[PDB]
Amino acid sequence: NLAPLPPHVPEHLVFDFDMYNPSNLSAGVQEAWAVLQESNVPDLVWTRCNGGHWIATRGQLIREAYEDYRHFSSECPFIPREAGEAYDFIPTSMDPPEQRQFRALANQVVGMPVVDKLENRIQELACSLIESLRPQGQCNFTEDYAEPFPIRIFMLLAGLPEEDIPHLGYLTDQMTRPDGSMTFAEAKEALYDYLIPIIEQRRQKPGTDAISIVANGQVNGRPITSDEAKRMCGLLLVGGLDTVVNFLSFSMEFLAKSPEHRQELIERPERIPAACEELLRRFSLVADGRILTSDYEFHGVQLKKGDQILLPQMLSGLDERENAAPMHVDFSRQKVSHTTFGHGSHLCAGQHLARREIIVTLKEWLTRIPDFSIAPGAQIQHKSGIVSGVQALPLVWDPATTKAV
Ligand code: HEM
Ligand SMILES: CC1(C)[C@@H]2CC[C@@]1(C)C(=O)C2
Ligand SMILES: [C-]#N
Ligand SMILES: [K+]
Ligand SMILES: [K+]
């Protein structure tokens, strides 16, 4: 389904990649995206899919564009254009310096000191979930751990009832991996309609939860408006309900196939933070982008005002120019180069929370369930979009080889 090639785009730069359904998806989603890094593909290409847009395919270009907000604006950061135009989340839809005071507030509610404060609850929940699954000798990891672990931590931090999880999970899915069942705008509005009365309640009677803190925060010497609070809280919900969930599944899928990697971490758990970084590189999963603020020649390519450019965070660390043998998982790489949490002013506000959840998962799962595998004859399917993911991950193990703590 191909949009007519714009007059300014030369034909040798055309490469019709579909970010929502890449042709090589059966090989794994990262593998499917890595077709953009084969020798037949220029550094910067135009796809006619999804309305037509640029794709930067090398880490150097991706990093440069994320730094240059003057030319590459976050005002319209999603493909297709309809989604990007409807996108108004805070701080992501803002460029510097406007994003700054909102980002500071975001750091207050999902940043480091908050992680350090909730760390006991994070540890508690991982141990509880895993111990409950342990005697079963099987699970569907996506529904049984990857979802409830980070999502329940988020709902705890946000002071939201766990019964709202299915609905919010559906809406966030529609924004990052659309079904066709609803436009981005309709999904976004449903999320907003959920938040609107909660924000008003918590402006009236403030709590100490993330929503209360955002809704009662200060911007530019004045109170945050109910609208601004809604737009930021909406982003926090999307940010809290999708990426870590899907990332955990890619990592656990890998570990299920790699006993030697499991033992490295069990025997020398001080290597776990580096392993976290390497898995974040290899199983990177986000791809959003920017819109051109003006005509601009970038690496020899003429970009036009209003052109969209996908700058896949996923691709920087898979670029062989950034990491040798990029598809190999090597916990001992001297430098794990990646932009998995993004780059520039919008570098993920939740990255500390994400890392903690990952490192807790690695340690606590491998302690109790050191030996496990993918269920016999199970076909693991990945999905692709703004955030890529694992559809289902059936795991099996012999309970006799497990340990309670
Ligand atoms: C492995 C897990 C995660 C990954 C890979 C990831 C990735 C990213 C990326 C690539 C961006 C930048 C998007 C852009 O530049 O347009 C971003 C932004 C953001 N993320 Fe995450 N993230 C993760 C976990 C989390 C968590 C747990 C939260 C908690 C709510 C969170 C909240 C946010 C927020 C609020 C922003 C916006 C920052 C800004 O625009 O200034 N993220 N994330
Ligand atoms: C691209 C993102 C990962 C980043 C945080 C959530 C997300 C889906 C956004 O809308 C901005
Ligand atoms: C961020 N998600
Ligand atoms: K390329
Ligand atoms: K917009």
Side-chain angles (χ1 to χ4, degrees), residues 14 16 24 27 34 61 97 122 152 155 173 179 205 217 222 227 277 310-311 335 348 363 376 400-401:
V14 175
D16 297 311
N24 222 319
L61 276 66
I122 295 169
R152 293 174 194 176
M155 301 297 271
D173 286 347
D179 228 330
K205 289 177 173 163
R222 52 87 188 176
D227 171 73
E277 288 313 288
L310 190 68
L311 301 166
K335 177 185 177 185
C348 180
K363 180 187 172 269
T401 67

Side-chain angles (χ1 to χ4, degrees), residues 97-304:
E98 186 181 23
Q99 48 63 240
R100 181 182 166 282
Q101 284 247 346
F102 293 104
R103 174 55 184 259
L105 187 52
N107 292 338
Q108 272 191 54
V109 302
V110 299
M112 331 181 42
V114 171
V115 187
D116 286 344
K117 194 215 72 143
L118 283 191
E119 193 149 312
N120 292 330
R121 304 312 300 282
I122 295 169
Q123 179 72 15
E124 178 192 26
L125 183 61
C127 292
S128 183
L129 260 25
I130 297 166
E131 174 54 25
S132 289
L133 294 171
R134 183 191 59 83
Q136 289 182 7
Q138 54 178 102
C139 69
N140 174 8
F141 183 79
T142 65
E143 64 177 305
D144 293 340
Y145 187 92
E147 289 167 20
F149 171 62
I151 296 173
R152 293 174 194 176
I153 292 170
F154 181 81
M155 301 297 271
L156 174 65
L157 163 56
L160 296 174
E162 286 184 1
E163 312 78 45
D164 294 340
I165 289 170
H167 181 59
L168 300 173
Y170 172 82
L171 293 175
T172 57
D173 286 347
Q174 297 315 310
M175 296 186 213
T176 57
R177 296 174 297 276
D179 228 330
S181 73
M182 68 198 308
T183 59
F184 177 89
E186 290 155 2
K188 193 197 61 166
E189 273 315 302
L191 180 55
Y192 283 167
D193 289 345
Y194 169 84
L195 285 170
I196 279 164
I198 299 170
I199 289 175
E200 179 71 14
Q201 290 162 22
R202 275 117 96 152
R203 273 184 130 223
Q204 295 192 46
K205 289 177 173 163
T208 50
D209 60 276
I211 294 167
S212 288
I213 298 298
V214 168
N216 292 283
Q218 277 265 122
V219 242
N220 191 230
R222 52 87 188 176
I224 193 167
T225 69
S226 295
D227 171 73
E228 287 162 344
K230 183 202 65 178
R231 293 204 271 145
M232 181 136 39
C233 287
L235 183 62
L236 295 177
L237 273 286
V238 177
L241 265 49
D242 214 35
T243 45
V244 177
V245 170
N246 286 283
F247 178 72
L248 290 174
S249 294
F250 289 120
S251 291
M252 197 61 71
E253 176 184 16
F254 173 75
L255 290 173
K257 284 132 47 154
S258 210
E260 291 79 3
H261 286 79
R262 302 197 299 254
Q263 284 301 134
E264 267 188 81
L265 303 190
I266 288 163
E267 297 165 27
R268 308 223 106 97
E270 74 267 29
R271 294 192 183 187
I272 290 171
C276 170
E277 288 313 288
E278 174 70 346
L279 294 168
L280 281 164
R281 182 195 68 78
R282 174 63 177 77
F283 302 107
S284 197
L285 75 173
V286 180
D288 73 345
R290 301 293 186 255
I291 188 169
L292 272 294
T293 60
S294 68
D295 293 354
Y296 181 50
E297 184 178 285
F298 184 63
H299 292 257
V301 178
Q302 298 291 340
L303 313 179
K304 287 298 181 102

Side-chain angles (χ1 to χ4, degrees), residues 12 14-15 35-42 45:
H12 68 263
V14 175
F15 186 84
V35 306
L36 290 159
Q37 297 173 325
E38 291 294 313
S39 64
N40 56 300
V41 187
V45 294

Side-chain angles (χ1 to χ4, degrees), residues 66 74 77 90-92 99 103 106 110 154 235-236 239-240 243-244 247 280 285-286 288-290 313 339-343 345-351 353-354 357-358:
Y66 276 128
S74 293
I90 293 179
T92 304
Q99 48 63 240
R103 174 55 184 259
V110 299
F154 181 81
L235 183 62
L236 295 177
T243 45
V244 177
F247 178 72
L280 281 164
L285 75 173
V286 180
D288 73 345
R290 301 293 186 255
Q313 285 88 349
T339 59
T340 290
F341 289 115
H343 191 75
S345 57
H346 294 280
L347 174 64
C348 180
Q351 66 176 328
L353 178 57
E357 289 172 348
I358 297 158

